[PDB]
């Protein structure tokens, strides 16, 4: 049976790790040959989930073409967020919930994206469509993904489908989703032993907005001041990235997960576009984004319109 | 509120009927959809529409003047779509082509399956939503599958397509083989067609790496009838190659009885057809044994050859 690799985006989050694991499980339970893998380091939030449900981290890879011919993408599509040698392999399927850009195939494929709050919400449907029992631990990881992406059902990307899936997955996993999820989210918001290099990369994604090359990085925190007091050090590593990668904009989005508000730190030639996007005045490279917590819903589309 | 649902430029039976079907499903679910088309209805589609007593969808050139959001069926690439696609939101795509030249600013419902017909996906979606398919609509959907599968003979045809057609022909009340052979024959009637119509009725533009390509297909029961018209075909094809700055125009003339096609290749990259299919062009043509499907047997090998 031909082996495939299943993985999500660089700088993996809980949905990208757990959805890779769950989809590989669903493929293997159906008699196929899948290995879930990851493209970077496991963050504290994901590690809490993996540890709680006694699951291993997926194997770390840098490339796929040395290993297999065919891959499945979960939780992303854009080339520049994917494995570095993505053009050397065939993308067989994509299960996702981001916007689509920078994605092309030579041949028809199974592309399944729904505008829902979490990729694992789609995978939940797929288990059922295929009449495969979701094991307790798998359900736990899928629930983790949903709580992560929805910030415990508070993010505006969260839909009724995500809430229903989480309800099913929590009963199967044997946990209280509120209690568990609060602890899980807090594990990811622990910024104590985090360097600024880590802060600006742990949840970084690159985009091309029109002709403009952009990186948007997000940080979950229980206290914006703890991050903001590192501003000079953050500006230094972000500046290095802006130069190195020839970005028109690096936007760091520092999210208060308790208040659902974010502080923007914008660096690069196109910083003033953030002002247009959000109707704010940047003062010393920062501004308050009231209510903004979702990159896919509240940052990418308005920043696209502003940049163009 | 209002949305428009349509398929590609140079509409085929799947593009017309799937737009009709999905609008019906949306409206039965209480939404507000109208199926539209981006060009002339071909003789095969017209057979289907006439047989199941259904009108042709309204022809449109633009969408942004009418609605804010659209749904694409049976295509995704920008240059295959409505003139002003950049001005509207793509809310959903239901499709079975390769993906290229397609970007959205926000998440969407993107649903592609590598099956033989878009209508096979829609059949599934009616069931998922517990909505009955009306007899006429089932016939249009059946027509789409027969059209795209060349009566289940094309290598794009899967067990799912066959199962959908079986259910649909039963709902519609027709013998699928009998009706299908007649429908297909109506599309292969090249008796009143100009050469301009031959190279355009089932034409699609692609970007193959850095190369600008147009691939047109025609159904025939007699390749010699079309090959008789080579000089005239080369005249109109060359015009297009110049006007659109194409690296290649590939005309695929398909014997639907024998499942073989004749290629007519014009353009600076004509020799890449020779690499793609391991054939030699003699007077711009070569027999492509077994080749009937653009999405599966043409676009991928031609992409490889050209890069
Ligand atoms: Fe993610
Ligand atoms: Fe996600
Ligand atoms: Fe079509
Ligand atoms: Fe089609
Ligand atoms: Mg996430
Ligand atoms: Mg995220
Ligand atoms: Mg077709
Ligand atoms: Mg076709």
HEC letters along A86-125 = HHHCEEEEEEECCCCCCCCCCCCCEEEECCCCCHHHHHHH
- The DSSP H or E segment spanning B293 is none
Q: Which residues of B touch A114 (CB under 8 A)?
A: 107, 109
Asked if B154 and B197 sit in the same domain, the reply is: no
Backbone angle region of A74, left / alpha / beta, with phi > 0 → left and psi within -120 to 50 → alpha: beta
Asked if A25 and A171 sit in the same domain, the reply is: yes
The partner residue sitting opposite A107, judged by closest CB among B101, B111, B300, is: B300
B109-112: strand order across its sheet: A59-60, A34-38, A4-7, A70-74, A90-96, A110-113, B109-112, B89-95, B69-73, B3-6, B33-37, B58-59
Rounded CA-CA distance A291/B188 in Å is: 59
Rounded CA-CA distance B239/A162 in Å is: 54
Q: Among B188, B208, B235, where does a domain finish?
A: B188
Q: Which residues contact B111 (CB under 8 A, 6 or more apart)?
A: A111, A112, A113, B92, B93, B94, B95, B121
Integer CA distances (angstroms), A125 to A61, A87, A167, B117, B124, in order: 28, 29, 13, 23, 14
What domain range includes position A230? 190-308
Residue with tokens 């391991």: B278
The partner residue sitting opposite B104, judged by closest CB among A100, A104, A305, is: A100
Q: Which residues of B touch A100 (CB under 8 A)?
A: 99, 102-104, 108, 110
Chain B nearest C-alpha distance from A107 (Å):
5
Q: Which residues contact B242 (CB under 8 A, 6 or more apart)?
A: none
Rounded CA-CA distance B237/B244 in Å is: 11
Q: Are strands B109-112 and B69-73 parallel, antiparallel or unpaired?
A: unpaired
Nearest Cα neighbor of A38 from A63, A14, A17, A67 is A17
Asked if A103 and A197 sit in the same domain, the reply is: no
Asked if B95 and B211 sit in the same domain, the reply is: no
Pick the residue of A69, A88, A97, A106 with the most B CBs within 10 A to test the interface with B by mutation: A106
Chain A nearest C-alpha distance from B34 (Å):
22
Asked if B184 and B97 sit in the same domain, the reply is: yes
Q: Which residues contact A204 (CB under 8 A, 6 or more apart)?
A: A10, A11, A215, A216, A217, A218
Asked if B18 and B161 sit in the same domain, the reply is: yes
The partner residue sitting opposite A113, judged by closest CB among B101, B107, B299, is: B107
Chain B nearest C-alpha distance from A51 (Å):
31
- Rounded distance from Cα B175 to ligand 5 centre (Å): 50
Q: Find the radius of gyration of the CA atoms of chain B.
A: 19
Asked if A136 and A16 sit in the same domain, the reply is: yes
- What count of Cα atoms within 13 Å lies in the side-chain half-sphere of residue B204? 26
Number of structural domains in chain B: 2
Residues B100/B117, Cβ–Cβ less than 8 Å: no
- Rounded distance from Cα B97 to ligand 8 centre (Å): 10
Asked if A10 and A151 sit in the same domain, the reply is: yes
Six-digit token pair at B108? 């969407």
Q: Among B140, B165, B188, where does a domain finish?
A: B188
Asked if B157 and B198 sit in the same domain, the reply is: no
Q: What single DSSP character describes residue A71? A: E
To 10 degrees, the CA torsion angle through B246, B7, B108, A142?
A: -100
Q: Which residues contact A82 (CB under 8 A, 6 or more apart)?
A: A7, A9, A10, A39, A73, A76
> CATH number, domain at A37?
3.90.1640.10
Q: Among A159, A189, A219, where does a domain finish?
A: A189
Neighbours of A185 (CB within 10 A): 22
Q: Which residues of A touch B300 (CB under 8 A)?
A: 106-107
Rounded CA-CA distance A146/A156 in Å is: 13
> CATH number, domain at A237?
3.10.310.20
- Rounded distance from Cα B230 to ligand 3 centre (Å): 26
Q: A217 forms bridges with which residues in the sheet?
A: A204, A252
Chain A nearest C-alpha distance from B95 (Å):
9
Asked if A279 and A166 sit in the same domain, the reply is: no
The partner residue sitting opposite B97, judged by closest CB among A100, A108, A296, is: A108
Helix/strand/coil percent split, chain A, to 5 = 40, 20, 40
**Elucidation method:** X-ray
Six-digit token pair at B72? 């694409």
- Residue A97 marked as a ligand binder: yes
Rounded CA-CA distance B54/B95 in Å is: 23
Say if residue A229 is exposed, middle or buried (CB neighbours under 10 Å; 0-12, 13-18, 19+): exposed
Rounded CA-CA distance B109/B105 in Å is: 13
Q: Which residues of A touch B99 (CB under 8 A)?
A: 100, 103-105, 109, 111
Contacts A–B by Cβ distance under 8 A? 81
- Residue A223 marked as a ligand binder: no
Q: Which residues of B touch A304 (CB under 8 A)?
A: 105
Six-digit token pair at B51? 């047989």
Rounded CA-CA distance A273/A292 in Å is: 16
Residue with tokens 């259910």: B167
Q: Identify the three-state secondary structure at position A60.
A: strand
Q: What are phi and psi of B255, to 5 degrees?
A: -75, 105
Q: Which residues of B touch A110 (CB under 8 A)?
A: 112-114
Asked if B206 and B174 sit in the same domain, the reply is: no
Asked if B181 and B204 sit in the same domain, the reply is: no
Q: Identify the three-state secondary structure at position B76.
A: coil
Chain B nearest C-alpha distance from A223 (Å):
29
Q: Which residues contact B127 (CB under 8 A, 6 or more apart)?
A: none
């Amino acid at each position: 049976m031909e082996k495939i690799l299943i993985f999500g985006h660089q700088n993996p989050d809980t949905d990208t790790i757990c959805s890779a694991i769950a989809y590989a499980d669903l493929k293997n339970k159906l008699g196929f040959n899948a290995e879930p893998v990851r493209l970077g380091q496991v963050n504290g939030e994901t590690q809490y989930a993996l540890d709680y449900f006694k699951q291993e981290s997926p194997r770390l890879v840098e490339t796929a073409a040395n290993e297999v011919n065919g891959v499945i993408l979960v939780d992303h599509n854009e080339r520049q967020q994917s494995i570095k040698d993505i053009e050397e392999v065939q993308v067989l399927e994509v299960i996702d919930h981001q916007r689509i850009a920078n994605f092309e195939t030579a041949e028809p494929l199974y592309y399944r994206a729904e505008p829902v709050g979490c990729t694992a919400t789609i995978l939940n449907k797929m288990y059922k469509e295929n009449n495969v029992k979701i094991e307790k631990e798998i359900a736990g990881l899928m629930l983790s993904a949903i709580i992560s992406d929805s910030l415990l059902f508070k993010s505006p990307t969260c839909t009724d489908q995500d809430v229903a899936a989480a309800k099913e997955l929590a009963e199967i996993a044997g946990v209280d989703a509120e209690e568990y999820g609060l602890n899980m989210l807090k594990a990811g918001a622990d910024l104590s032993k985090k360097t600024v290099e880590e802060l600006i990369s742990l949840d970084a994604k690159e985009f091309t907005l029109g002709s403009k090359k952009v990186e948007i990085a997000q940080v979950n925190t229980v206290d914006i001041e703890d991050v903001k007091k590192r501003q000079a050090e953050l500006e230094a590593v972000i500046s290095k990235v802006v130069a190195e990668k020839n970005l028109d904009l690096f936007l760091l989005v520092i999210t208060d997960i308790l208040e659902n508000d974010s502080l923007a730190l914008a660096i690069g030639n196109e910083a003033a576009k953030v002002e247009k996007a959000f109707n704010v005045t940047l003062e010393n490279n920062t501004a308050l984004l009231k209510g903004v917590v979702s990159r896919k819903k509240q940052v990418v589309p308005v920043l696209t319109d502003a940049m163009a």
